[PDB]
Amino acid sequence: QEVQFFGAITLHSKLMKHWHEVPKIVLNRLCISLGAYIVHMLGGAIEEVINTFQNQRMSADVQLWIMLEVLTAIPEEAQVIHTSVKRVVLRAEIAKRVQLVIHTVERYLKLQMNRVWDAEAYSNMNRAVKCVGTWIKNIGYTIEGCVTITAVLLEVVHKCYWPCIHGCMTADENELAESCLKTMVNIIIQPDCHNYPKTAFVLIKMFLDSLSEITKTEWKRENDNEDIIVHIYMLFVSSVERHSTLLLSGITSADPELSILVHRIVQEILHCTDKPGIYPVEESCSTMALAFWYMLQDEVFAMSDEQKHKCWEYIKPLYAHLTRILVRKSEQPDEKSLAKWSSDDLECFRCYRQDISDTFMYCYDVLNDYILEILAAMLDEAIADLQRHPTHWTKLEACIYSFQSVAEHFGGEEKRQIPRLMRVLAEIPYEKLNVKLLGTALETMGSYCNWLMENPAYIPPAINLLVRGLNSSMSAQATLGLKELCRDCQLQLKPYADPLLNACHASLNTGRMKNSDSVRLMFSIGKLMSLLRPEEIPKYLDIIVSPCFEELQAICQADSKTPAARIRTIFRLNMISTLFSSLNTDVDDQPIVQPVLLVMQRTMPIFKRIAEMWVEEIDVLEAACSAMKHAITNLRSSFQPMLQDLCLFIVASFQCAPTLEISKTAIVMFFKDEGCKPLMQQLLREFIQHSFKLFESTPEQNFSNISDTMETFFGCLTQIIKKIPQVLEDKTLAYDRLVFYAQRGMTLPESGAIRNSIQFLTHFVMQSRNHAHVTEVVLATGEQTLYTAMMCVGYLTPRSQVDKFADILLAMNRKYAAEMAVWMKSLMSTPNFPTQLITDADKTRYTALIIKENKRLLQQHLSEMAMKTRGLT
Numbered sequence: 001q002e003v004q005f006f007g008a009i010t011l012h013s014k015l016m017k018h019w020h021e022v023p024k025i026v027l028n029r030l031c032i033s034l035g036a037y038i039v040h041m042l043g044g045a046i047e048e049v050i051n052t053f054q055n056q057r058m059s060a061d062v063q064l065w066i067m068l069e070v071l072t073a074i075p076e077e078a079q080v081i082h083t084s085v086k087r088v089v090l091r092a093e094i095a096k097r098v099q100l101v102i103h104t105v106e107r108y109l110k111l112q113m114n115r116v117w118d119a120e121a122y123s124n125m126n127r128a129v130k131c132v133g134t135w136i137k138n139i140g141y142t143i144e145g146c147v148t149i150t151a152v153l154l155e156v157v158h159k160c161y162w163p164c165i166h167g168c169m170t171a172d173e174n175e176l177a178e179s180c181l182k183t184m185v186n187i188i189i190q191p192d193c194h195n196y197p198k199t200a201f202v203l204i205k206m207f208l209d210s211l212s213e214i215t216k217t218e219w220k221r222e223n224d225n226e227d228i229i230v231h232i233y234m235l236f237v238s239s240v241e242r243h244s245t246l247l248l249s250g251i252t253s254a255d256p257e258l259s260i261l262v263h264r265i266v267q268e269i270l271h272c273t274d275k276p277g278i279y280p281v282e283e284s285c286s287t288m289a290l291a292f293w294y295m296l297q298d299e300v301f302a303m304s305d306e307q308k309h310k311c312w313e314y315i316k317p318l319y320a321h322l323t324r325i326l327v328r329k330s331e332q333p334d335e336k337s338l339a340k341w342s343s344d345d346l347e348c349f350r351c352y353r354q355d356i357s358d359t360f361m362y363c364y365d366v367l368n369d370y371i372l373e374i375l376a377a378m379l380d381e382a383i384a385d386l387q388r389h390p391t392h393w394t395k396l397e398a399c400i401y402s403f404q405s406v407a408e409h410f411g412g413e414e415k416r417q418i419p420r421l422m423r424v425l426a427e428i429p430y431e432k433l434n435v436k437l438l439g440t441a442l443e444t445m446g447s448y449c450n451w452l453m454e455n456p457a458y459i460p461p462a463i464n465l466l467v468r469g470l471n472s473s474m475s476a477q478a479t480l481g482l483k484e485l486c487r488d489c490q491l492q493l494k495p496y497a498d499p500l501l502n503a504c505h506a507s508l509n510t511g512r513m514k515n516s517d518s519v520r521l522m523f524s525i526g527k528l529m530s531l532l533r534p535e536e537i538p539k540y541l542d543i544i545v546s547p548c549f550e551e552l553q554a555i556c557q558a559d560s561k562t563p564a565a566r567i568r569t570i571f572r573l574n575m576i577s578t579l580f581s582s583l584n585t586d587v588d589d590q591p592i593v594q595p596v597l598l599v600m601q602r603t604m605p606i607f608k609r610i611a612e613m614w615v616e617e618i619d620v621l622e623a624a625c626s627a628m629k630h631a632i633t634n635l636r637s638s639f640q641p642m643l644q645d646l647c648l649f650i651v652a653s654f655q656c657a658p659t660l661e662i663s664k665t666a667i668v669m670f671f672k673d674e675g676c677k678p679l680m681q682q683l684l685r686e687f688i689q690h691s692f693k694l695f696e697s698t699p700e701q702n703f704s705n706i707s708d709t710m711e712t713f714f715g716c717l718t719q720i721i722k723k724i725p726q727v728l729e730d731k732t733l734a735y736d737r738l739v740f741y742a743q744r745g746m747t748l749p750e751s752g753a754i755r756n757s758i759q760f761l762t763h764f765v766m767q768s769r770n771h772a773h774v775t776e777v778v779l780a781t782g783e784q785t786l787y788t789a790m791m792c793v794g795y796l797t798p799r800s801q802v803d804k805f806a807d808i809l810l811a812m813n814r815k816y817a818a819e820m821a822v823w824m825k826s827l828m829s830t831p832n833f834p835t836q837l838i839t840d841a842d843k844t845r846y847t848a849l850i851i852k853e854n855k856r857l858l859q860q861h862l863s864e865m866a867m868k869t870r871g872l873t
Contacts, residue, residue, distance in 0.1 A: 008033070594635055
C-alpha cells in the first residue's frame with residue numbers, strides 16, 4: 001500500500017536519472033514518469049497522446065485527469081531532466097508544441113464551461129488551468145495567442161465568484177479561481193521578443209474591465225474571501241510592474257483610452273492600499289502596493305526636464321493622497337482588538353510598519369516639506385478626535401509614528417512643523433490614555449534629538465516628557481531617547497543638569513525600572529554628570545554610583561554563590577561599566593580631575609575581590625573586564641596612572657577570554673608612548689606565557705574544550721600585531737610556540753579558531769619580512785605551516801571551512817614566493833598520499849595553480865581540490 005508509492009518513486013527517479021542505463025499519488029507519479037519518458041523522445045508525440053486520451057478509448061474524467069497530469073509534467077521535467085540534447089534546444093523544441101497545448105486546454109475549457117460542475121470537474125479544470133500556467137511560465141509564449149485563453153480564464157474566474165454570493169466560496173471554486181488568476185499573472189509577466197504596447201494594453205484593459213466589478217463588490221465589506229481579492233490585486237500590481245513604460249507614457253500621452261486605463265489602475269492600487277482593517281488580521285492587500293509606490297517614485301525620478309514636469313504635476317497629488325492613507329494604515333489595534341492577534345501577526349504588523357516608514361521616506365522624496373503639512377493636519381484631526389472621544393489613542397499614535405518616520409530628512413531647520421509636533425507631544429495627557437502612545441512619543445522625541453540640537457528652546461518639555469517616560473513602563477523607549485538626547489545637544493543640557501540627575505536618581509530609587517533600562521540610564525547619567533561643577537560631583541557619586549559598590553560588597557561579605565547574587569553582581573558591574581562609558585569631564589568650570597579615575601582608585605580592591613569570588617564563572621569576569629574596557633575607551637589619554645594597578649589586576653586574573661581582551665585593549669591603547677611601552681611589553685609577556693601554561697593542557701580534550709580561548713587569543717594577537725608593528729621588534733616572546741599552537745589552531749573544528757589562527761598567521765607572515773628575528777621563525781616553521789594548511793584543506797577541517805585557508809597561502813606568496821614554491825612543490829610531490837583518493841595529475845595541476853596566483857580564484861581551486869581529496873561527489 002504505502003510502499004507502492006516508494007516503488008513508483010523509485011521508477012521515477014530511475015527514469016529521470018539513468019536514461020543512459022537503458023539503450024491516487026501513485027497515479028500522479030506514474031503520469032509524471034510517463035511525462036519524462038515522453039520528454040526523452042526527440043522524434044508529434046504530444047499530439048498523439050492528447051488525441052488518444054481525449055478520445056476516451058481507455059473513466060473519461062479520470063482519463064482526462066491523467067492526460068492533464070502528463071501534459072503538466074512534460075515541461076517541468078525538461079527543466080531538471082538529464083537529457084542528452086542541449087537544454088536550450090529542448091526548450092526550443094517544446095516551444096513548437098506550446099500553441100497546440102494552449103489550444104487543447106482552451107477548447108477543453110470552452111467545452112467544460114457549458115456543462116454543470118462536479119467535484120471531479122473542478123479538479124480537472126483546476127489541473128487544466130495549472131497546466132497552461134506552468135506551460136507559460138516554463139516556456140515562453142506569444143501574448144497574441146494568449147489573449148483568447150485569457151478571456152476564457154476571466155470567464156472561469158467569474159463563474160467561480162458569482163454563484164457564491166448571497167458570501168464565501170466553496171474553497172474548491174476558490175482554488176479554481178486562484179489557479180486562473182495565477183496563470184493570468186504568468187501570462188502577463190512573460191518576456192516578449194517584441195514588446196507591443198497594444199497587446200499589453202489589451203490584456204490590462206481586459207483584466208480591469210472584467211475584475212473591477214469584483215474588486216468593487218468586495219472592497220466595501222470586510223469580505224471573507226481575501227484570496228480572490230488579493231490575487232486580483234496581485235495581478236494588477238504585477239502586470240503594472242512588468243510594463244511600467246506603458247504606465248508613464250500613459251500619464252504623459254494624450255490618448256484618452258491609455259490615460260483612462262492608467263487612472264483606473266492607479267485607482268485600484270489605491271483601493272488596495274487603503275483597504276479597510278488592519279494588516280494582516282482584517283486585510284492582506286496593502287503589502288503588495290508599497291513596492292509599487294516605491295518603484296513608481298524611483299522611475300519618475302530616473303526618467304526626468306521636458307515632460308517630466310508634467311509627470312510631477314500628476315504624481316505629486318497622488319503621493320500627497322498616498323501619505324494620508326499610510327497614516328491610517330499605520331494605525332495599530334486597540335487593547336480590545338489585539339486580543340484576537342497572534343504573535344506572528346504582531347511581528348508581521350511590525351515589519352509592515354517598517355515598510356510604511358520606508359514608503360513615508362519615498363513620499364518625502366516626492367513631496368519635500370509638504371509631507372509635514374499633511375502629517376500635521378492629520379495630527380490635528382487626531383487631537384480633535386481625542387477631544388471628542390477621550391478614549392481614542394490610536395490615531396494620535398499613528399500620526400506621531402508617521403512623524404518619526406520622516407525625522408531623518410529635515411535636520412534642524414527650517415522645520416516649522418517639528419515645533420508644532422513638540423507642542424502637541426507636550427499637550428497630551430498620557431496618564432488618561434494608553435501607555436503605548438507615550439512609548440511611541442518617546443521614540444519620536446528621541447528621533448528628533450538633532451533637531452533639538454539645532455533649537456535650544458524646546459529642550460525642557462522634551463526632558464520633562466523623558467522623565468515622565470522613565471516613570472512609566474515605557475522606560476526602555478524613554479531611556480533610548482534620553483541617551484539619544486545626551487549623545488547630541490549635550491552642551492545645551494548643561495543648565496538642566498542637576499534637576500535631571502535628581503530625576504534619574506528618583507527613578508532609580510523606585511524599584512520598578514527594569515535592569516537593562518537602569519544600565520542605559522546609567523549611560524545617560526554619566527554623560528550628564530560630565531557637565532557638572534567639581535564641587536557638586538561627589539554628591540552624585542555617593543548617591544548614584546556608591547549603592548552599586550555597597551551591594552557588591554554585601555555579596556562579597558555574604559560570600560554569595562547564589563544565582564540571584566550572580567545576576568545582581570553582573571547587573572551592578574554593567575551599571576558601572578556603562579557609567580564609565582559616558583562620564584568624560586573634558587567638554588569643548590570643568591573639574592581638573594576625571595571622576596572615573598578617582599572611582600577606580602577607590603574601588604580596585606573590590607574588583608580584585610569580585611574576581612577572586614567568581615573565578616569559576618566567566619560571566620562576572622566578562623562584566624568587570626567590560627567595566628575596565630569601557631573605562632579605557634572613554635578616557636584614553638588620561639587613564640595612565642591607573643594602568644599599573646590594571647596590570648596588577650590582570651596578572652591577578654591570570655593567577656580566560658575577557659582578561660585577554662582587556663589586555664589587548666590596554667596594549668593597543670597604551671603601547672605608543674611615555675613609558676607605557678615597558679608596562680605593555682611586560683604585560684604582553686605575561687599574557688602570552690600564562691596562555692601557554694593553559695595550552696599545556698592535553699590537546700585531545702583541550703583542543704575542543706578550550707577552542708573559544710584559542711579564538712579569542714589569536715584574534716587579540718592578530719589585532720595587536722596589526723595595530724603595533726613595534727611589538728614584533730621584541731625578541732623576548734616565544735614566537736615558535738605561538739606558531740605551533742596556531743598550526744594547532746587551524747586543526748580545530750570551530751570556525752572562530754580557524755579564522756583567527758589563519759588571520760594571525762597571515763599578518764605574522766606579513767610582518768615577518770620587515771624583521772630578521774621574525775623571519776627566522778617564519779623560515780623555521782613555514783613548511784610545517786603549509787603542511788598543516790594542506791592537511792586541513794585535504795581532510796582535517798570541515799568542508800565549509802576550506803575558504804578560510806587561501807589567505808595564509810596568499811601571505812606566504814607575497815612575503816616569501818620562493819619559499820612557498822619550493823615548500824609546496826616538495827610537500828605535494830614528495831608524499832605518496834596527502835590523501836589517497838586524489839589523482840597524482842590533478843593534485844600536481846592544482847598545486848601548480850596555487851603557487852601562481854587573487855583570493856577568489858584560489859578559493860575556487862582550493863574548494864575543487866578539497867572535493868577531489870575527500871573524494872566527494
